[PDB]
Curated annotation (Swiss-Prot), chains A, B:
Domain of life: Bacteria
Protein name: L-2-keto-3-deoxyarabonate dehydratase
EC numbers, comma separated: 4.2.1.43
Keywords associated with the record: Arabinose catabolism, Carbohydrate metabolism, Lyase
Biological process (GO), any one: L-arabinose catabolic process to 2-oxoglutarate
SUPFAM superfamilies: Aldolase (SSF51569)
Length: 303, 303, 304, 302
């Protein structure tokens, strides 16, 4: 039934050492992630350092990546913004350029600006009225906004284009179960995230998609395939094999994991983050590569 | 000795009922606030709904307001952004269009993306390198970032343009006390904020400027002048008279307090916030105007 | 209509200089606060430094303060605890010593340990099933726990003893409006707190009670008097006169406001908090007494 | 050269189904965890549901557990409390009953009551003046209190009994690197926690001790043994084998992991938490046992 399933890794934003956008590295990283087996791509998400770029750069990347994907895989464009009209504009802007789906945090700002449920509902309702592609609601700690399972289900049933969900708050597996139980057939895509650290538990709960990091979709995807085909022991086997790398990305190297792997493999030219995000500790990067070389991922043997 | 002191109210951003920028009303709001006796103005701050406007709208508002002010009063342009290079470029642009000062939060995003002290310092150090006008460090809850007084004085002594501070975390008076003690004459501008709810205590602590709401700066300003010339009983008198209005702004009508008074006074065409910020409860608005009509502020008798 | 209304200020916990309980100063403040015109008292709340005392001191203070009150005014005993059975046992114990009402935060601990709505409901339902006195649900920032107006109203409808509420979260006035509309007759006591900083807005919203600081109940009570008597303009004027002192308590002197006023007024022997809560800044203490001496509060003219 | 190192798992608090203390199961739990190779034990911590018990239960549990240990292993008693004198008196009482060490969060309450750095320093300095056993500073998210690495290093270099640390804030490994460098010889034990989820990275950073869950210390301890012996590939191997179980405890079953495993293995009579802590979802419990039964833990053959 669902339009979109599988692994949809987050595309990192590639900068040159000057801090400017490095679009040549950007298309190569997309090509690798496509060649790695991704069922799709999510762009301008938090692992893309979206908070560190400008509206103009955000426009450049939505055209650059979408035109370079050329229809190979579906693309999820992250369009989060406090203003409803801005988010609807970006979302409509994304669909015209060929986006298959838009993802949006609830409206929020910083540590103190929160939006009541009634206006959060209006926010997603009006973005849904503006576009013809489905909306993925992001339930992540960065928003500091509580989206209960009953409220999430209510939006999927009462708002047409609300159909997908990225549950990455603590206890996502239990929340995924309740989201599916309460939303019924309006929950088209209950997905998890957080670099697939709880993927095994979430697949038990009914997750049909995973928004992972971009470093090694090839290493994670067979877990979902083995889960869909009922090969649960193969699922635990691959999960246990790649869990130390997943755990290192989730806890140590963080956002810069994919870029540090893509740079060591010659996929992109510079793994630098945009200042002032701290760069990777040399030992943290050393341990990341040590773990990654026990698993032989495509990123280190692609260029 | 210092370049700036007094009352520097926040200019709200005036939208049309459709949500687009209402530049005609935006110019009227500036002229009223200048006519209310404001020593200066600060634009694109939290009470300007800056988190709900686009980058293009920032540049539109920065030029349009800095052109309409025509050097009458100095203007602080808020340029906060996570990226160091983006904030520095906005800060240089503000300087080129005639800003007397720039205000920037520490780099942050949402509830979870924080920056360590070392990189925060580098952030302000690099923005100071790019400009020749003073920088106002903002110490506010919205950033979720701890900026200790030893670290704040650290920056004022060892970063060239860092000389002004807006203190509005809880216990701001006692923080203003410790900041002035550790920093001395390097603390050129120890200012307070939060709509001047704690102004009297902050004046005791040694505050020389106040960034307040934009609705009634004529009501608050005599307390700074009365304190400037040692009339602390006159200062208390005007503080007690206007504190119920200030308390209603801080606790009830919030960001929209200024636009509600201007719209009632015919100063602007629309007091609507940009959705999804909740609109004022009708009782909250009536109670706001009931207290305002008791004190005869210029905004209700200007058009 | 309701069992209780009016001002219900929080009784501070009086320590000696070295930090042990000063029950002698503890009883004098109780007498003073009743002299100042309190419709009732709340003990062991946040302004009582309840987080800094032991379980044995909690029972000592509950037994001592309730016996010294002698039924003069109703007493709300704060019984908050993470554990359902501990809070329920505390609330039954308080009821047995003469407590008129119990106040309980939702179950929580620290910055990270929270409780789902379904178990918060079960928490209060079991605390209600254990006692025969009203329960006041505390909606305050300290718990870091979201309690919506529909959830609070549902608890008031479906859980017998849940009938009072202390709304202290931001936007308390409009939340009181939504609570009363959704809860109806189940809302016996929609009250506010936060030292009466938002009282005038809250009285507009329908607030029938206030849990304030204990330093100057005589200063705040006339606002609610004039409000229940329809003298709206006199309520504003009284609110405006005492607002710089309320504001100084809310923003500057904080918890220690009541103790600094009671110490200076000779009501208690020591104002000091229990370490490591910082002591009052000298300037902050001086500005507190300066503002108070403009208002002639009983705490600075109590001869007992 | 440090007094204490190795694995010091948290002893959960065993309740009855009714909610009362189940002391009979409590002693069995302690005996199993000692049987599982624990270098020491930590009691009344967060995985013990310390926030759900009263002071009297706190005292009764400290007496019962210490007496049942009889000095077989060193015991760390968690004595956290906002009040300095209350924490000092708890730490002294723990000492007189034979505790080798005390662990204390910085003073805090709920989501809004924080203590400035200077008063935190006085808090630990005063608890140190009152006792003659080492102090473990707990740097954990539950306190909502930021403790920088220079500050933690300063407390140990300048406060006598402050000598151990449990680093559970995010990015613990990189904070442990800085704390170890800054603290110098003054840090007797830089330890990690969080059920050993970051154990490998924290061993790289120089952690010499781990405060884990109580369900399978036999499964985690060989990781520390191999690392101290310099067998880093073996340390990774045992870490990978047990990481699915560690991950499930950290993210899915949580505090109830140890008790659920012990109840299944017959160690304890009831795995329930104290209400209103939610009970384990049955699917979460079934996934936990499925993973544990792939590893032959002592808890399922005790």
């Amino acid at each position: 039934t669902p339009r979109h399933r599988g692994i949809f890794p987050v595309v990192p934003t590639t900068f040159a050492d000057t801090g400017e956008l490095d679009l040549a590295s950007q298309k190569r990283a997309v090509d690798f992630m496509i060649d790695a087996g991704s069922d799709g791509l999510c762009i301008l998400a938090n692992f893309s350092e979206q908070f560190a770029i400008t509206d103009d750069e955000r426009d450049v990347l939505t055209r650059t990546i979408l035109e370079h994907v050329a229809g190979r895989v579906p693309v999820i464009v992250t369009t989060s913004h406090y203003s409803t009209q801005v988010c609807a504009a970006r979302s409509l802007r994304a669909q015209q350029l060929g986006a298959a789906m838009v993802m949006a945090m609830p409206p929020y700002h910083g540590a103190t600006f929160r939006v009541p449920e009634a206006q959060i509902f209006e926010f997603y309702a009006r973005v849904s009225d503006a576009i013809a592609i489905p909306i993925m609601v992001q339930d992540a700690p960065a928003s500091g906004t509580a989206l209960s399972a009953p409220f999430l289900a209510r939006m999927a049933r009462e708002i047409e284009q609300v159909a997908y969900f990225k549950i990455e708050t603590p206890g996502a597996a239990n929340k995924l179960r309740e989201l599916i139980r309460l939303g019924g057939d309006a929950i088209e895509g209950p997905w998890d995230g957080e670099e697939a650290i709880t993927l095994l538990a979430d697949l038990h709960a009914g997750a049909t998609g995973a928004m992972t990091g971009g470093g090694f979709p090839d290493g994670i995807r067979p877990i979902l395939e083995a889960w869909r085909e009922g090969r649960h022991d193969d699922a635990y086997a691959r999960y246990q094999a790649w869990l130390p790398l997943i755990n290192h990305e989730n806890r140590q190297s963080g956002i810069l994991t994919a870029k540090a792997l893509m740079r060591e493999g010659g996929v992109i030219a510079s793994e630098r983050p945009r200042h002032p995000m701290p760069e990777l500790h040399p030992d943290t990067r050393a341990e990341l590569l040590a773990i990654a070389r026990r698993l032989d991922p495509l990123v280190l043997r692609w260029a």
